[PDB]
Design an enzyme around this catalytic site. Sequence first.
Site, PDB file in Angstrom:
ATOM      1  N   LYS A  72      16.167   1.713  -1.133  1.00  0.00           N
ATOM      2  CA  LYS A  72      15.952   1.279   0.232  1.00  0.00           C
ATOM      3  C   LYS A  72      15.452  -0.381   0.298  1.00  0.00           C
ATOM      4  CE  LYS A  72      11.880   4.082  -0.261  1.00  0.00           C
ATOM      5  NZ  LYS A  72      10.635   2.839  -0.192  1.00  0.00           N
ATOM      6  N   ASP A  89      16.224   7.061  -4.272  1.00  0.00           N
ATOM      7  CA  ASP A  89      15.874   6.658  -2.874  1.00  0.00           C
ATOM      8  C   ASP A  89      15.676   5.081  -2.667  1.00  0.00           C
ATOM      9  OD1 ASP A  89      15.045   6.944  -0.073  1.00  0.00           O
ATOM     10  OD2 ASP A  89      12.753   7.436  -0.546  1.00  0.00           O
ATOM     11  N   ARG A 148       0.842  -1.090   0.027  1.00  0.00           N
ATOM     12  CA  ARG A 148      -0.012   0.103   0.264  1.00  0.00           C
ATOM     13  C   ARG A 148       0.980   1.284   0.147  1.00  0.00           C
ATOM     14  NH1 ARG A 148      -5.449  -1.796   0.376  1.00  0.00           N
ATOM     15  NH2 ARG A 148      -5.163  -2.604   2.384  1.00  0.00           N
ATOM     16  N   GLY A 149       0.215   2.414  -0.470  1.00  0.00           N
ATOM     17  CA  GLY A 149       0.642   3.886  -0.579  1.00  0.00           C
ATOM     18  C   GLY A 149      -0.171   4.793  -0.627  1.00  0.00           C
ATOM     19  N   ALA A 150       0.210   6.134  -0.437  1.00  0.00           N
ATOM     20  CA  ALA A 150      -0.471   7.338  -0.630  1.00  0.00           C
ATOM     21  C   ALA A 150      -1.584   7.221  -1.732  1.00  0.00           C
ATOM     22  CB  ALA A 150       0.485   8.567  -0.361  1.00  0.00           C
ATOM     23  N   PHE A 151      -0.992   6.821  -3.031  1.00  0.00           N
ATOM     24  CA  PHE A 151      -1.592   6.755  -4.389  1.00  0.00           C
ATOM     25  C   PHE A 151      -1.950   5.464  -4.655  1.00  0.00           C
ATOM     26  CE2 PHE A 151       0.743  10.853  -3.671  1.00  0.00           C
ATOM     27  CZ  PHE A 151      -0.120  11.714  -4.307  1.00  0.00           C
ATOM     28  N   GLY A 152      -1.897   4.595  -4.091  1.00  0.00           N
ATOM     29  CA  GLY A 152      -2.206   3.021  -4.573  1.00  0.00           C
ATOM     30  C   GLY A 152      -1.820   2.002  -3.663  1.00  0.00           C
ATOM     31  N   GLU A 153      -1.846   0.576  -4.415  1.00  0.00           N
ATOM     32  CA  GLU A 153      -1.594  -0.463  -3.547  1.00  0.00           C
ATOM     33  C   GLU A 153      -1.120  -1.416  -4.766  1.00  0.00           C
ATOM     34  OE1 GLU A 153      -5.843  -2.879  -3.319  1.00  0.00           O
ATOM     35  OE2 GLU A 153      -6.047  -0.930  -2.073  1.00  0.00           O
ATOM     36  N   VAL A 154      -0.271  -2.575  -4.364  1.00  0.00           N
ATOM     37  CA  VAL A 154       0.314  -3.662  -5.004  1.00  0.00           C
ATOM     38  C   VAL A 154      -0.690  -4.833  -4.551  1.00  0.00           C
ATOM     39  CG1 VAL A 154       2.395  -4.655  -5.507  1.00  0.00           C
ATOM     40  CG2 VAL A 154       2.583  -2.411  -5.162  1.00  0.00           C
ATOM     41  N   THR A 162      10.332  10.675   3.789  1.00  0.00           N
ATOM     42  CA  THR A 162      11.199   9.925   4.571  1.00  0.00           C
ATOM     43  C   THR A 162      12.451   9.784   4.442  1.00  0.00           C
ATOM     44  OG1 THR A 162       9.262   8.679   4.931  1.00  0.00           O
ATOM     45  CG2 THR A 162      11.104   7.618   6.045  1.00  0.00           C
ATOM     46  N   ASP A 185       9.806  -0.946  -7.441  1.00  0.00           N
ATOM     47  CA  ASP A 185       9.415   0.428  -7.028  1.00  0.00           C
ATOM     48  C   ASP A 185      10.321   1.598  -7.610  1.00  0.00           C
ATOM     49  OD1 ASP A 185       7.710   2.276  -5.899  1.00  0.00           O
ATOM     50  OD2 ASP A 185       8.339   2.063  -3.662  1.00  0.00           O
ATOM     51  N   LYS A 192       0.327  -3.230  -9.408  1.00  0.00           N
ATOM     52  CA  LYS A 192       0.516  -2.115  -9.082  1.00  0.00           C
ATOM     53  C   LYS A 192      -0.520  -1.430  -9.441  1.00  0.00           C
ATOM     54  CE  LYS A 192       3.835   1.691  -7.634  1.00  0.00           C
ATOM     55  NZ  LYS A 192       5.103   1.991  -7.508  1.00  0.00           N
ATOM     56  N   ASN A 229      12.772  -1.565  -1.696  1.00  0.00           N
ATOM     57  CA  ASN A 229      13.063  -1.703  -3.191  1.00  0.00           C
ATOM     58  C   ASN A 229      13.701  -3.050  -3.324  1.00  0.00           C
ATOM     59  OD1 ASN A 229      12.420   1.085  -4.417  1.00  0.00           O
ATOM     60  ND2 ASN A 229      13.519   1.476  -2.535  1.00  0.00           N
TER      61      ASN A 229
HETATM   62  C1  LIG Z   1       4.444   6.023  -3.080  1.00  0.00           C
HETATM   63  S1  LIG Z   1       3.023   5.936  -4.172  1.00  0.00           S
HETATM   64  O1  LIG Z   1       1.621   5.672  -3.550  1.00  0.00           O
HETATM   65  O2  LIG Z   1       2.910   6.875  -5.165  1.00  0.00           O
HETATM   66  N1  LIG Z   1       3.032   4.482  -4.896  1.00  0.00           N
HETATM   67  C2  LIG Z   1       3.000   3.050  -4.441  1.00  0.00           C
HETATM   68  C3  LIG Z   1       1.686   2.714  -3.990  1.00  0.00           C
HETATM   69  C4  LIG Z   1       1.586   1.394  -3.464  1.00  0.00           C
HETATM   70  C5  LIG Z   1       2.630   0.617  -3.426  1.00  0.00           C
HETATM   71  C6  LIG Z   1       3.880   1.084  -3.465  1.00  0.00           C
HETATM   72  C7  LIG Z   1       4.968   0.456  -3.293  1.00  0.00           C
HETATM   73  C8  LIG Z   1       5.563  -0.186  -4.387  1.00  0.00           C
HETATM   74  O3  LIG Z   1       5.819   0.172  -5.467  1.00  0.00           O
HETATM   75  N2  LIG Z   1       5.729  -1.879  -4.293  1.00  0.00           N
HETATM   76  C9  LIG Z   1       6.120  -2.729  -5.361  1.00  0.00           C
HETATM   77  C10 LIG Z   1       6.142  -3.982  -5.140  1.00  0.00           C
HETATM   78  C11 LIG Z   1       6.298  -4.425  -6.439  1.00  0.00           C
HETATM   79  C12 LIG Z   1       6.363  -6.135  -6.665  1.00  0.00           C
HETATM   80  C13 LIG Z   1       6.685  -6.755  -7.869  1.00  0.00           C
HETATM   81  C14 LIG Z   1       6.760  -8.269  -7.988  1.00  0.00           C
HETATM   82  N3  LIG Z   1       6.287  -8.940  -7.110  1.00  0.00           N
HETATM   83  C15 LIG Z   1       5.802  -8.419  -5.785  1.00  0.00           C
HETATM   84  F1  LIG Z   1       5.548  -9.166  -4.803  1.00  0.00           F
HETATM   85  C16 LIG Z   1       5.878  -7.049  -5.483  1.00  0.00           C
HETATM   86  C17 LIG Z   1       6.646  -3.840  -7.363  1.00  0.00           C
HETATM   87  S2  LIG Z   1       6.706  -2.087  -6.740  1.00  0.00           S
HETATM   88  C18 LIG Z   1       3.852   2.589  -4.054  1.00  0.00           C
END
Ligand SMILES: CS(=O)(=O)Nc1cccc(CC(=O)Nc2cc(-c3ccnc(F)c3)cs2)c1
Lengths: 393, 395
Positions: B196, B194, B80-86, B233, B212, B101, B199
Amino acid sequence: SFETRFEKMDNLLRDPKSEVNSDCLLDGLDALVYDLDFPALRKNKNIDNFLSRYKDTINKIRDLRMKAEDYEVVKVIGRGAFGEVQLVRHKSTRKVYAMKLLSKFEMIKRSDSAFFWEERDIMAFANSPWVVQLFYAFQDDRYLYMVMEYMPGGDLVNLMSNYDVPEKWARFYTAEVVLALDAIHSMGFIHRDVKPDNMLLDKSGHLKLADFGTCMKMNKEGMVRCDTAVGTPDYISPEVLKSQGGDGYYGRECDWWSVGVFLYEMLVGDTPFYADSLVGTYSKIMNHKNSLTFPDDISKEAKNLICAFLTDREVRLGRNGVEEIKRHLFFKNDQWAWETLRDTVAPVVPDLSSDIDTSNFDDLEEETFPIPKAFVGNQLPFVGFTYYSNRRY
Amino acid sequence: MSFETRFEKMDNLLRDPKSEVNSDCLLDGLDALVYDLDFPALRKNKNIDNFLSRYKDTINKIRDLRMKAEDYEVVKVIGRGAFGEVQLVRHKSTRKVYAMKLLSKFEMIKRSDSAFFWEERDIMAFANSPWVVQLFYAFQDDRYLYMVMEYMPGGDLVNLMSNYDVPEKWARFYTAEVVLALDAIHSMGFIHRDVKPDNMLLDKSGHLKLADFGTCMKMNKEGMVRCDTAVGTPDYISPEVLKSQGGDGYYGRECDWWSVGVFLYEMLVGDTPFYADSLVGTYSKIMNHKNSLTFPDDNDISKEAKNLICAFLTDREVRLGRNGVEEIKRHLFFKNDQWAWETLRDTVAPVVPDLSSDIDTSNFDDLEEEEETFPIPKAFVGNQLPFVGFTYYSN
Ligand SMILES: CS(=O)(=O)Nc1cccc(CC(=O)Nc2cc(-c3ccnc(F)c3)cs2)c1
Ligand SMILES: CS(=O)(=O)Nc1cccc(CC(=O)Nc2cc(-c3ccnc(F)c3)cs2)c1
């Protein structure tokens, strides 16, 4: 299935008759960039960023796709209210064509039709020796362009104006008009504007119909429902003239009336319902039963065909199809056969000096939409007019 | 150029998966127009009204045929994030398992910033690197963006660090993979900014893949990037990126090397070197890294590990990697009798995932749980425009 969905989608991008093929899709983006690039609209960052993001790309697309500056204009060979026709040479291929331009501003400034669509389809897909061919159709923010094959022999107006047409020539041109109109009818259209101006001659001296801006698609019963008259004051049928919100339902017999007017003109030298005023001509058509007369030369058979077409729709020759027209004694001859006519030698064979000879064309001599204060979408009614990236072969 | 050449160049442009005008982007353009014009207020204009009526049946067909969210069965929310979810998903037809995503268009228009998704799209679609999570398809509707990726079932480095007191031999492995993965990104012309543990993802084999790419940016001619967007952060952010806020600074790829030093420190010490309670406290500690960076009084971390940390946790002008990767690769910390740089991803990983099924989510911490939309515009606003051309389909 996933594959089926992928394939259906892929075929849709390729089909020359698809609303979402590469030509339409590119036109759609070209329209957006044209209709948004105004300082007033650019105050909106969604619009401003989009335009900045597509700047370089839209320039590339504009440069690669067919544009007006690809053509070297030789001579203006026709004019009209909404546009003009010109003899052009494609600078790269060196190929010679006739290009019909239509002003998008003039069209939008009350034209109550979208008449250019049927003209594009008829020429693009007719695939008939009797119909002028469309090679390419393109556009810019100002015009529509229709790249057609050049008919160097001029039209029948020009021919009639330089010759006292003998009956044997008139039989030939009428027979070709009958075959050409029948091709159009077979495609499911009524021409509604048959006149010598729309009868063109190729390098060989054979006929091809042009100017399809009034063509309309017949319904299930082979009829059209029109509440407002269409055509030319001289060549218009009684039923198309009276066509109203109450009545206004008619078939292909209206094109057979126009043939009779054409025949009369070739042999007599004037239109049968000619009057000093334009309104006088309207009165004479409506009163054809008493106004149609012959001067004191024209044969029994020629006079009969004229009168067989210049009658009320319900008793008009051709109400029962072409074979009754074809069998008319006027066409009885020992020179040609209907099925082989366009293979015979024409009465007048053009004598042309070059690929750009314009001797059969009489010597011929703008305001745009304002800068919009808000989004108006003036390029939208023209999306998909392009015939370039997805052509039939 | 000839007529045929111009025709061919134009035709190839409609097919090229890297083209701004290929079929899928051109379809996005039309899908945007129909979304952004279908409002009674705008329909008062006959140009708009006739166009919409002309494309009604067609746009419905296109919408139904092209990839859409209802093609995917959602198994579990794995981020999860401010603009969405995985989320872990299964494509209903193919039965294939992916990670998806999602990004809220409304949220991106509201809080501005609707451009960060492009670099993440390109990096995953075209990287073609064992070090980068692959993008299979990218699609959208009036509400969201969707990125279909290969699922990395081993979870991330945050999870690993939380379940193990990382030995130095493991830290050497993960740092080395991060160095190779960051180098792949750099070779594509991107600075991560960034980096971390969040990522750093692990595949079924236990090997690293970066994911990410929301803070990614394309380097200019001089291999430099400049930004005016605020920081979220600062724990792993370099002093140059924190200083350059408002576009008052151009920085290079060394900023990603500082983050590696933070990661190494975290694995071996158990905490971030510049942690503070407040976000502003962390920023102060980073800006004062020369005096704030310390090590605990336990013989545990080796001479070489302490040296690499300090070699990265320095000012950009004296930082290891300012002269390229080969000076990082040659650092004595990596000296070992187990692997070689050129063969590392073929070696057996320190932690191999033990998975029960194709949809095993044991390495993903359990995630909990209304959608506000745009209003009906009185005039043309063009909310779908910043997203035209996001669609991507592999073959
Ligand atoms: C910071 S935001 O809200 O603009 N974007 C955002 C929203 C939800 C989650 C994330 C974090 C994110 O990008 N997580 C990711 C997971 C995976 C991923 C890929 C393959 N297998 C997985 F299990 C996870 C790719 S990006 C960022
Ligand atoms: C009356 S309008 O302004 O709506 N359209 C219009 C504009 C210019 C000219 C005309 C008349 C017309 O249709 N002329 C045509 C000429 C040719 C043509 C084709 C091949 N060779 C030629 F030499 C001429 C095709 S249509 C109509």
